[PDB]
Design an enzyme around this catalytic site. Structure first.
Site, PDB file in Angstrom:
ATOM      1  N   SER A  19       0.814  -1.211   0.000  1.00 31.65           N
ATOM      2  CA  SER A  19       0.000   0.000   0.000  1.00 31.65           C
ATOM      3  C   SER A  19       0.852   1.267   0.000  1.00 31.65           C
ATOM      4  CB  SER A  19      -0.911   0.022   1.224  1.00 31.65           C
ATOM      5  OG  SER A  19      -0.168   0.358   2.382  1.00 31.65           O
TER       6      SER A  19
ATOM      7  N   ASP B 139      -2.288  -5.558  15.780  1.00 35.53           N
ATOM      8  CA  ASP B 139      -0.956  -5.021  15.482  1.00 35.53           C
ATOM      9  C   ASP B 139      -0.540  -3.937  16.470  1.00 35.53           C
ATOM     10  OD1 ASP B 139       1.492  -4.844  14.131  1.00 35.53           O
ATOM     11  OD2 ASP B 139       0.705  -3.456  12.613  1.00 35.53           O
TER      12      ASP B 139
END
Ligand code: NI
Length: 258
Positions: free
Chosen positions: A25, A140
């Site tokens: 990304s 995360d």
């Protein structure tokens, strides 16, 4: 293209890209032209790297994320497919993060005072309790993913992992207790300026099953802080506390260290 006001944050035409701020990304700083609000615009090539199934999972997950709404969690304004790409529009957190904060302390060769640790940690707990109350796992948690605005507000960021829980090392399911493991590692890291298990997965596994991490100094960090770390990084997920208990401790300790 041209402004489409009915479309809110759900079309690229309503944003002006200002700069590329990240890649790998790709991530841009942009402004919403309808209201002048600054955003991070993330572009993901889900058709050049993603299977039909992973695509639906990723999308269903983003849809759950968009329902979140809390001052200490990065807001997901929108997500949409356009130009054969997934576009995620996020609250912009531009001023720094916990990873950078820890580096400042390392450079000034000093530890983070306990009261300062709680000042930020309690906000992180607020974020994570919001998420768990909404039945969403973060997945995360790490210092570089805990943004800090210019005014010292914590923003838990968007979702070889930095903190590897034992259940993840052995490929069991990530669950709410795995978030607690990372949260405990993070608390330790604020206090020690190093991850508890700072290698390979086998030696990592060994250390975890034997709490082979250096104790925090008792002259700088309270029994409360040290025990909270100890329980959050218990190898056994059933032995770790829920976020609600961690949050309650953080709030009590924040209140009396300030
Ligand atoms: Ni093992």
């Amino acid at each position: 293209k041209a402004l489409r006001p009915d479309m809110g944050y759900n079309t690229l035409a309503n944003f002006r890209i200002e700069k590329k701020i990240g890649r790998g990304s790709e991530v841009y700083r942009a402004a919403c032209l309808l209201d002048g609000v600054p955003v991070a615009l993330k572009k993901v090539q889900i058709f050049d790297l993603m299977d039909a199934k992973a695509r639906a999972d990723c999308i269903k997950e983003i849809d759950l994320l968009k329902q979140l709404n809390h001052p200490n969690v990065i807001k997901y304004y929108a997500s949409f497919i356009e130009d054969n790409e997934l576009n995620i529009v996020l609250e912009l957190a531009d001023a720094g993060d916990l990873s950078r904060m820890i580096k400042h302390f390392k450079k000034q060769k000093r530890l983070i005072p306990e009261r300062t640790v709680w000042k930020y940690f309690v906000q992180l707990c607020s974020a994570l309790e919001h998420m768990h109350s909404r039945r969403v796992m973060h997945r995360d948690i790490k210092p570089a993913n805990v943004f800090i605005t210019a005014t010292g507000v914590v923003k838990l960021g968007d979702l070889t992992p930095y903190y590897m829980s034992p259940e993840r090392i052995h490929e069991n399911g990530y669950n709410f207790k795995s978030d607690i493991w990372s949260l405990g590692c993070l608390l330790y890291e604020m206090a020690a300026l190093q991850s508890p298990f700072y290698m390979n997965l086998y030696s990592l596994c060994k250390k975890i099953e034997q709490c082979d991490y250096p104790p925090l100094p008792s002259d700088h960090y309270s029994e409360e802080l040290r025990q909270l770390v100890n329980m959050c990084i218990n190898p056994d997920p059933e032995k770790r506390p829920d976020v609600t208990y961690v949050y309650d401790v953080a709030k009590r300790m924040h209140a009396c260290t300030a």
